């Protein structure tokens, strides 16, 4: 069910308490999000805790951190917040996030590129859903990432070689290469962006 169970009630109670604690001290919310938590709880916390609109204040600071995991968490948190609170400040922070993604696309190595872009690419669907003005920047960034990853695929011999496929239909759903996996992830997030904007 995922909605009609004791787990949902417990999540609501915990969200109420966390709402109270964040109201009492927003610095606790900032510290918790700098620590991070599993991203499976992100829609839960964003929907169930009204205090999270303050998270847009320290997301630009969290993005600036040198840890890759903190930046990944900032991107995912911003995506969920943008889904919840579609505001001009949210749009500005989303623009900053896309700019940061484009910037460190040319800073991260191949392993770092895989590690950063596998969790944060589905978040780009949320920015497109919330902000149609980001269509140009997000599609341009996706084209850049796809071209970089296609180059990386061409660098070495591959078990799949997605370069020569080139014409696949919607391949709806293993221990594969990171580069072909990232290529497939780019294709899938582009498909999700298109389907949302056409259905």
């Amino acid at each position: 069910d995922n909605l009609l169970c004791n787990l949902r009630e417990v999540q609501c109670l915990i969200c109420c308490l966390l709402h109270q604690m964040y109201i009492a001290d927003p610095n606790i919310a900032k510290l918790v999000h700098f620590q991070g938590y599993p991203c499976e709880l992100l829609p839960l916390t964003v929907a169930g805790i009204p205090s999270m609109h303050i998270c847009l204040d320290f997301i630009p600071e969290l993005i600036a951190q040198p840890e890759l995991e903190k930046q990944i968490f900032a991107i995912q948190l911003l995506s969920h917040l943008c889904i919840q609170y579609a505001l001009p400040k949210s749009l500005s922070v989303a623009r900053l996030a896309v700019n940061v993604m484009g910037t460190l696309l040319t800073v991260l190595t191949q392993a770092k590129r895989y590690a950063f872009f596998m969790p944060t690419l589905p978040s780009l669907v949320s920015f497109c859903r919330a902000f149609p003005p980001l269509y140009e920047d997000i599609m341009s960034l996706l084209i850049q990432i796809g071209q970089v990853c296609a180059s990386d695929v061409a660098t070495q011999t591959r078990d799949i070689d997605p370069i020569i496929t080139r014409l696949q239909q919607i391949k709806e759903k293993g221990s594969m290469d990171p580069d072909v996996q990232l290529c497939h992830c780019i294709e899938r997030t582009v498909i999700e962006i298109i389907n949302m904007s056409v259905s």
Partner: peptide, 24 residues
């Protein structure tokens, strides 16, 4: 007096538009 290298390296990643920087 300048040989001590009493300065901090520019620990930043100048973020391109298409000011703000990512610390190191």
């Amino acid at each position: 007096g300048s040989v001590g290298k009493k300065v901090v390296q520019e620990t930043g990643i100048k973020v391109r538009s298409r000011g703000f920087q990512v610390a190191l």
